């Protein structure tokens, strides 16, 4: 009942609550997933007005489980559904703050949710993060994984004008392989608040 | 927990096991519901062959629930889901034979199901039915509401070369108003298969 949930297009609600170095705000996304095709729709807002932070360096942060896993790569996230799993991170910023983060991605009725939390410290003042110096955009990257959970290792980069993700994923209630994401972010034209249009495409 | 179903776009599943002066066949048909917009998209596919009969006569059979209900009249389909609700109807086609179906509507998972039986008696050969006449094409039709259950009653009207539906419906675990139907039938041009493509719109 695993990939059986993931066999078409399933809705999503993200929500996040944040605090790097006292700033806190919230972030709410809905969309949708199609595991099939590895694609990720998704539109994420700031409740709480500008985001103290760039919003790139939330992408990671904020449903893995719709990666498109090949065919003879089933056996090896969606394992874990519906009951769903934790998934936790540790994020350094070279020269600037860490992000440490909790998430529950589980499914809550028909809905697919990811509830997560995270907390930055040591962030330094007029930074990459702080200054608002870091470019709209996204790099295309690789995915590693490897306690009856899965263990992940990546380093993510940012377009600066001018981050070493450690994950942990565990079950709520799989062999060496890795997955390969692309995204792209955007606005909505029609969008007064902070915000984040995204689309992404991820197989393994 | 009815209409709280319904705030999005819902995955449907439509099976129709039906038997007309003999003529056994099966039908079953994937796609989607948007009940915030009265909008349906699906394709049906006859698994047994050539249908026997024409593809009009079987889409007031083959998901009311997708309808669109004025904001002002949500208080009065969504109300008897997730359980969902049985729905029954004779048809008589003038001068031709009548159809007696059974329909259980309801939740399977996530995935709004359409479980159908259909049987028909007494059609003339060479007739409207079965000599194949009809045209492929539906026109705009009203829906009549007022036993805890729903009542129904509507003419259709089928474009020939050259229908009276009674509709009883029943919760598995409402004042008088009205819907408006309008439909699209179309074909999949990569299709091999009898089959059917259906766009529909209705409101109340």
């Known amino acids: 009942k695993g990939e059986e949930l ?3 297009v399933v809705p999503i609600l993200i929500e996040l609550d944040g605090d790097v170095n006292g700033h ?4 709410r996304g809905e969309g949708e997933g199609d595991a ?4 990720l729709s998704l539109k994420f807002i700031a409740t709480t007005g500008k985001l103290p932070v760039p919003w790139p ?3 990671t942060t904020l449903v893995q489980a719709f990666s498109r896993y090949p065919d ?36 809550e009725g028909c809905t697919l949710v990811n509830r997560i939390e995270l907390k930055g410290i040591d962030f330094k003042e007029d930074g990459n993060i702080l200054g608002h110096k870091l470019e709209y955009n996204f790099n295309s990257h690789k ?18 004008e001018d981050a070493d993700h450690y994950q942990q994923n565990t079950p709520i209630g799989p062999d060496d392989h890795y997955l390969s994401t692309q995204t792209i972010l ?8 902070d915000h984040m249009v995204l689309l992404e495409y991820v197989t393994a």
Do not use: C, W
């Open 24 to 27: 806190k705000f919230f972030v």
């Open 72 to 107: 003879h790569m089933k056996r090896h996230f969606k394992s874990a559904m519906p009951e769903g799993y934790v998934q936790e991170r540790t994020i350094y910023f070279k020269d600037d703050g860490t992000y440490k983060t909790r998430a529950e991605v589980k499914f």
């Open 186 to 193: 955007s606005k909505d034209l029609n969008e007064k608040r």
């Open 57 to 59: 360096t939330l992408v």
């Open 6 to 8: 993931f066999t078409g």
């Open 143 to 160: 995915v590693y994984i490897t306690n009856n959970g899965i263990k992940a290792n990546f380093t993510i980069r940012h377009n600066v």
């Open 36 to 39: 099939t095709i590895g694609k």
